[PDB]
Amino acid sequence: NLEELMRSGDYAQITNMLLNNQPVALVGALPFITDSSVISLIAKLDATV
Amino acid sequence: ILHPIDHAFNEYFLQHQLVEPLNNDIIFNYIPERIRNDVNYILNMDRNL
Amino acid sequence: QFDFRASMHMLTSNLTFTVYSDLLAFVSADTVEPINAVAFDNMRIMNEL
């Protein structure tokens, strides 16, 4: 849960799931950008943000 | 080139030093127990030792 | 009288450490937003909101 995370301010469970690569699901309302080009998908802009 | 008396004093100053290693697992024990196990306070190490 | 054999000595120490006097500037420190502050029982103090 993203919102509870924002509340308690832990950031030690998700740090220990982004330092090593574990499949994870950040649930909560969020913005997005709309990428449209293909090269910026061939370039892995997924895990950058 | 020291006197044995002066060597006794200086070797006392060299052997017994009151200096000993510091890491992130001693600063973590230096803070009190209630603050270690409080969810209100969020404490970690953002510096290398 | 000066005897060089009973006066030459090899003194032993370390090389280039650094002592730290504060020990608590190495703790990065944040807090939950105080509307969400809870007690020992994880129930919120200042229930009244």
Automatic annotation (TrEMBL), chain C:
This is Inner capsid protein VP2. The record marks 8, 10 as: Interaction with the intermediate capsid protein VP6. It is found in: Virion. Sumoylated with SUMO1 and SUMO2. Sumoylation of viral proteins seems to have a positive role on viral replication. Belongs to the rotavirus VP2 family. Homodecamer; each decamer is made up of two conformers of VP2, called VP2A and VP2B. Interacts with a VP1-VP3 complex. Interacts with the intermediate capsid protein VP6. Interacts with NSP5. Interacts (via N-terminus) with NSP2. It comes from the Viruses. Inner capsid protein that self-assembles to form an icosahedral capsid with a T=2 symmetry, which consists of 120 copies of VP2, with channels at each of its five-fold vertices. This capsid constitutes the innermost concentric layer of the viral mature particle. It encapsidates the polymerase VP1, the capping enzyme VP3 and the genomic dsRNA, thereby defining the core. The chain holds residues 834 to 882 of 882 of the full protein. The N-terminus binds RNA. It is necessary for encapsidation of VP1 and VP3. The N-termini of 10 VP2 molecules form a cylindrical hub underneath each 5-fold axis of the inner capsid.
